[PDB]
Design a protein around this nucleic acid. Structure first.
Ligand SMILES: Nc1ncnc2c1ncn2[C@@H]1O[C@H](COP(=O)(O)OP(=O)(O)OP(=O)(O)O)[C@@H](O)[C@H]1O
Ligand SMILES: [Ca+2]
Ligand SMILES: [Ca+2]
Ligand SMILES: [Ca+2]
Ligand SMILES: [Ca+2]
Ligand SMILES: [Ca+2]
Ligand SMILES: [Ca+2]
Length: 903
DNA sequence: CATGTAGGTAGTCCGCG
DNA sequence: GCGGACTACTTAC
């Protein structure tokens, strides 16, 4: 096989690399790497190295990496550019793997682990590590085994061995319900003292040294706890055995009363699954406990146990250990679904970076671009210092707040990257400037044509047309991968709707799910077979299709994020190719594009409807337009339609066969105007929205910029079995909004859009009557606990103290002295409830760590003093008032002359 | 050590015979 | 109590 790296580190003048050799064996090696950097030299000097602007360079080959670094400083002091890759391990990877890396994940040791630490005196701080580690579960991907390390004897209790037999039993039979598919994969190892456990864990670690290390919160808890605990018991050099190169760095972040730390283990790539999840999932959760996320992702129940976690080992060691095992498995289950490790490996090896550097788009792109330029013997520029400077972004249209009955939306495929490719925006493709007119003059095609030689953006920049830029070149590659995967995702989505339609008429038979590839639209033959399948087989197929869609979503959305990240990095001062001329060339072009195409669409629709000056585009944001299709429907007359699907078909066809071609013509004209390199503004129909035919539903509404709701029947070619709400910005989409209020607001919206005012009023009335019976957590608001200390004046709120921070302070006073109450952690999420006047907490609100029940000591009083009236008013009624006044209807029947009668 | 800007809601403060 | 500045939190792109 082809060789590929696992990890790379620079330590002094040595590169330390772990890799897979040609026989698929894991190897390690130390290399005294001899780096090169470069300097401009005179034209006369014949060379094979040129900078990206074609200026000749001379290679400086160094004896060691220290000399290279030293040289960079001397050049800085002289005042001359020091070119080349200054992150030497990227150069090493580039020299060592001068080819497209094909890696085999089965050779990569991916470790997933989690530890337990009984602590009777509060949270067990990793920096102090003063309590025994009494359980570790460590899953190894190469062995496919869960290695369980169980402490039987501790100063907090001596316990019996854990029973795998009881673990496998159903919880309703007193077992722990450890999933049956991992029972045979568990290797259980009890220990009579902690030192032997830890010694054996280290020996185990040596034999099975993680390459990728993950788990839930491992970076902020498990890893620093294990490191510091081993350090305190055996000494630091023993602790350093967690690094295959025996080197670590201890990052101490000053949390103030007290503190915590991150440990860097050289030769390992730590990918904390919480960080992967936050970067790659595109969710905004109110809690990030493993219980919450597992139930969200997997629909599995919360791990239930009686009493506090500090007493679980002593009271029920059996359950303690099972839950340690299960917690580790749940991360594997989430990853089986989401495939973030696979994505990390894909992206890492594509870029030729340390795998943990996928968290940094700047590092990722720096490596991609360096490797691309190196292949052509070109030399990358020195990184420079720049002051932070705000710059303009997208255009968002001010909508008229209203109900909007029939709406069709369109937007640009991969807008900013397409702009980069169309205009040819790169550091080395800049050809000059032109004198800019006001943007509106370009939008209305009255400004002079910027150039008939170069490709232009309305920010004043000109670019070469006849040569490739490294930015366009490399952004196109990732874009094309993105496009591939989104096709797979959308096919699986369409495939899923077919299955949902068939589930309306399941067959009474015993059969199996069809063996199909869900990434491709089902053939007619497959669809015929599906119409005869049973419910059981159909439901299994739907699950598989949805998993295929999620996998495709992970792959496409994050490659989208990567290329959009390249456009943004051009406006980040730490990016090697930072340049506001290029950043603003993109955003300014985008502003012109949206407003140009608004004009063109209004012109076109007026023409075909035989009218003049009517406004068809009602809204747009960055690269999208929203078109009122009311006059389109009225032209033919609603009477002509047989059902909802018929008018949907009609608008679908109208957009495809009439509008999109008019849009393409409009954009081709814009392209000629800017004399761009390549026409790539492809604005395809997104949503088709309206009320069901014959209903009193309003179809949709806008309250303002970035705030609207649409009843959608077709989305990017997916014709839904059941209409789906597209809601943006409204309170239903906000993690700060209480969970049950999101639900109730969404149902208010559904009724408004699908059923009408009377339906809304009926629901509003019921919810108002039943509000007070909802579970307290379900109606608590959520917020992030930032800068708590800043407003903490003697345990009381300082000036300008935010509401949520005030609630945290109230909480801290209420739990003072109580050692079991969980502390609010700086930066983390909290539930928040308002409190009636005169409450025993002595303030207007309370807040506690999210994803948890509030400690039993104060829970009773919180429940007793909750202010339901404030809560209903602020979280539900006030947002609903916004929706309904915008839509021009009432959530409560207004008084009128009719009130005089008895109906 | 290092993607971007645009934009709405709701909080505190402060003015207000 | 209500409604402007000033701003934290948060989401749409
Ligand atoms: N997270 C982000 N970081 C930087 N720029 C972004 C981000 N999200 C959106 N943008 C900018 O807004 C543009 C339009 O956003 P949009 O969500 O329509 O995605 P897109 O890149 O056009 O891809 P799609 O083909 O899925 O529409 C992007 O091309 C850019
Ligand atoms: Ca635990
Ligand atoms: Ca788009
Ligand atoms: Ca699209
Ligand atoms: Ca059937
Ligand atoms: Ca868009
Ligand atoms: Ca109490």
């Amino acid at each position: 096989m082809k060789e590929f790296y696992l990890t790379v580190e620079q330590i002094g003048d040595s590169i330390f690399e772990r890799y897979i050799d040609s026989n698929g064996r894991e190897r390690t090696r130390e290399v005294e790497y001899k780096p090169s950097l470069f300097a401009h030299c005179p034209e006369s000097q014949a060379t094979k190295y040129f900078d990206i602007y074609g200026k000749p360079c001379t290679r400086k080959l160094f004896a060691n990496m220290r000399d290279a670094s030293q040289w960079i400083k001397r050049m800085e002091d002289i005042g001359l550019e020091a070119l080349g890759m200054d992150d030497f391990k990227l150069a090493y990877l580039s020299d060592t793997y001068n080819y497209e890396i094909k890696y085999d994940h089965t050779k990569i040791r991916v470790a997933n682990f989690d530890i337990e630490v009984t602590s009777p005196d509060g949270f067990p701080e990793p920096s102090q590590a003063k309590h025994p580690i009494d359980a570790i579960t460590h899953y190894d991907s190469i062995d496919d085994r869960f290695y369980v390390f169980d402490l039987l004897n501790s100063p907090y209790g001596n316990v019996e061995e854990w029973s795998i037999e009881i673990a496998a039993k159903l919880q309703e039979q007193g077992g722990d319900e450890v999933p049956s598919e991992i029972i045979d994969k568990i290797i259980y190892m009890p220990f009579d003292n902690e030192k032997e456990l830890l010694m054996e864990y280290l020996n185990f670690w040596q034999q099975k040294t993680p390459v990728i290390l993950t788990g839930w919160n491992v970076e902020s808890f498990a890893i620093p706890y294990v490191y510091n605990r081993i350090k305190n018991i055996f000494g630091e050099s023993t602790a350093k055995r967690l690094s295959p190169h025996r080197k670590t760095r201890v990052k101490v972040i000053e949390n103030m009363y007290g503190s915590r730390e991150i440990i860097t283990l050289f030769g390992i790539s730590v990918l904390d699954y919480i960080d992967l999840y936050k970067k790659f999932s595109f969710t905004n959760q109110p809690s990030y406990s493993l219980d919450y996320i597992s139930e969200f992702e997997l629909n599995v129940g919360k791990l239930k146990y009686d009493g506090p976690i500090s007493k679980l080992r002593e009271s029920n060691h059996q359950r303690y250990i099972s839950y340690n095992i299960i917690a580790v498995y749940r991360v594997l289950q989430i990853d089986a679904k989401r495939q973030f490790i696979n994505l990390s490996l894909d992206m890492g090896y594509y870029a030729k970076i340390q795998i943990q550097s996928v968290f940094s788009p700047i590092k990722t792109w720096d490596a991609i671009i360096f490797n691309s330029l190196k292949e052509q013997n070109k030399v990358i520029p020195q990184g420079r210092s720049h002051p932070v400077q705000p710059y303009p972004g997208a255009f968002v249209k001010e909508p008229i707040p209203n109900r909007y009955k029939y709406v069709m939306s369109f937007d640009l495929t991969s807008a900013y990257p397409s702009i980069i490719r169309q205009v040819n925006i790169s550091p080395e493709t800049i050809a000059g400037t032109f004198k800019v007119a006001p943007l509106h003059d370009y939008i209305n095609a009255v400004a002079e044509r910027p150039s008939d030689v170069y490709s232009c953006s309305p920010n004043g920049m000109m670019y070469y047309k006849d040569r490739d830029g490294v930015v366009p070149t490399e952004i196109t590659k990732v874009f094309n991968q993105r496009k591939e995967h989104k096709g797979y995702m959308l096919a699986a989505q369409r495939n899923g709707e077919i299955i949902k339609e068939a589930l309306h008429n399941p067959n009474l038979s015993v059969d199996e799910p069809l063996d199909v590839d869900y990434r491709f639209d089902f053939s007619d033959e497959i669809k015929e077979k599906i119409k005869k399948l049973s419910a059981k087989s159909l439901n299994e197929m739907l699950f598989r299709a949805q998993r295929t869609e999620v996998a495709g979503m992970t792959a496409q959305i994050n490659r989208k994020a990567l290329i959009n990240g390249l456009a943004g990095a051009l406006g980040n001062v730490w990016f090697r190719y930072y340049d506001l001329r290029n950043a603003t060339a993109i955003t300014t072009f985008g502003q012109m594009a949206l407003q140009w195409i608004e004009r063109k669409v209004n012109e076109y629709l007026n023409e075909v409807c035989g009218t003049e000056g009517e406004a068809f585009v009602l809204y747009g944001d960055t690269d999208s337009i929203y078109v009122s299709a009311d006059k389109i429907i009225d032209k033919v007359g609603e009477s002509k339609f047989r059902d909802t699907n018929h008018w949907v078909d009609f608008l679908d066809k109208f957009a495809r066969e009439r509008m999109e071609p008019a849009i393409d013509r409009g954009f081709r004209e814009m392209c000629e105007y800017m004399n761009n390199k390549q026409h790539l503004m492809f604005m395809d129909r997104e949503a088709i929205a309206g009320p069901p035919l014959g209903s009193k539903g309003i179809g949709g509404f806008w309250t303002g910029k970035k705030r609207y709701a649409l009843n959608v029947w077709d989305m990017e070619g997916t014709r839904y079995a059941e209409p789906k709400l597209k809601i943006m910005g409204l309170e239903t989409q906000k993690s700060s909004t209480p969970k049950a209020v999101q639900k109730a607001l969404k149902e208010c919206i559904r009724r408004m859009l699908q059923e009408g005012e009377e339906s809304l009023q009926e629901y509003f009335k019921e919810f108002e009557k039943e509000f007070r019976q909802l579970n307290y957590i379900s109606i608590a608001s959520v917020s992030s606990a930032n800068n708590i200390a800043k407003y903490d004046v003697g345990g009381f709120p300082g000036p300008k103290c935010p509401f949520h921070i005030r609630g945290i302070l109230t909480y801290n006073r209420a739990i003072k002295g109580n050692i079991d109450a969980p502390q609010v952690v700086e930066g983390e999420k909290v539930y928040v409830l308002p409190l009636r006047e005169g409450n025993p907490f002595g303030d207007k609100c309370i807040a506690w760590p999210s994803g948890t029940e509030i400690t039993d000591l104060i829970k009773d009083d919180v429940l007793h003093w909750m202010d339901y009236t404030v809560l209903l008013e602020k979280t539900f009624i006030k947002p609903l008032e916004g929706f309904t006044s915008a839509a021009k209807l009432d959530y409560e029947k207004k008084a009128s002359l009719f009130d005089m009668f008895d109906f």
